[PDB]
């Protein structure tokens, strides 16, 4: 399934690289323990080959998912009640789930909100964090620049 140098997406740390596969062991069985390393947290993570889809490490999202999240865009009519604390807990639970389409929907909901009102401190931190990981995901999905994806943003963020 996976080979050397695969640009592979790791929850919740996003896209990353593999260097090699250690044939280290437990109980004498030398499983395909692949080493994976990121540039965000600057660490290496040894991963067994078996639990890859169990942890949910995943190949990069293509133009079909890019067009899916653009289809998610410019359709922000959703209802949240006065319990915006419940909204914060809800999209916090979203951010814990780490679905790409859902992260896109929440950052465009917050774009809708600060486009209208403006947010509070932790709300803007929420927006900035989920936005930066989403745009890192997109900019390595297209395999291009971060600021180039940011230029894509402002023409897809309510344009």
């Amino acid at each position: 399934i996976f080979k050397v140098g695969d640009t592979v997406v790791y929850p919740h740390h996003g896209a990353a690289l593999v260097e090699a596969i250690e044939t280290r062991t437990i109980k004498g069985e030398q499983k395909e323990y692949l080493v994976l390393k990121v540039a965000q947290g600057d660490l290496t993570v040894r991963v067994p080959a078996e639990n890859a889809e169990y942890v949910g490490v995943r190949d990069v999202v293509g133009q079909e998912g890019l067009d899916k999240v653009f289809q998610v865009l410019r359709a922000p009519h959703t209802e949240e009640p006065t319990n915006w604390s419940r909204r914060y807990k809800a999209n916090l639970e979203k951010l814990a789930s780490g679905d790409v389409n859902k992260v896109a929907e929440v950052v465009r909901d917050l774009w809708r909100r600060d486009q209208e009102r403006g947010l509070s401190a932790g709300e803007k931190r929420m927006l900035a964090k989920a936005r930066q990981i989403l745009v890192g995901e997109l900019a390595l999905a297209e395999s291009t620049d971060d600021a180039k994806a940011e230029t894509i943003l402002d023409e897809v963020l309510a344009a």
């Binding site: 600057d42 660490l43 290496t44 040894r46 067994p48 639990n51 169990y54």
Partner: protein, 49 residues
């Protein structure tokens, strides 16, 4: 788990520390390692201690 206590260089020379009232010191880098027993990983960062 922890591993590899290693030192960096010092951040200033002695006389410059003694003049500008900065303490003479050097940073600590410690290679930590987190393991989930339930699924199995290592998390080898280089912690600025």
């Amino acid at each position: 788990s922890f591993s590899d206590p290693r030192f960096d260089d010092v951040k200033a020379p002695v006389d410059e520390c003694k003049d500008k009232d900065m303490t003479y010191a050097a940073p600590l880098f410690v290679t930590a390692e987190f393991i989930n027993n339930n699924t199995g990983e290592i998390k080898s960062q280089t912690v600025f201690m």
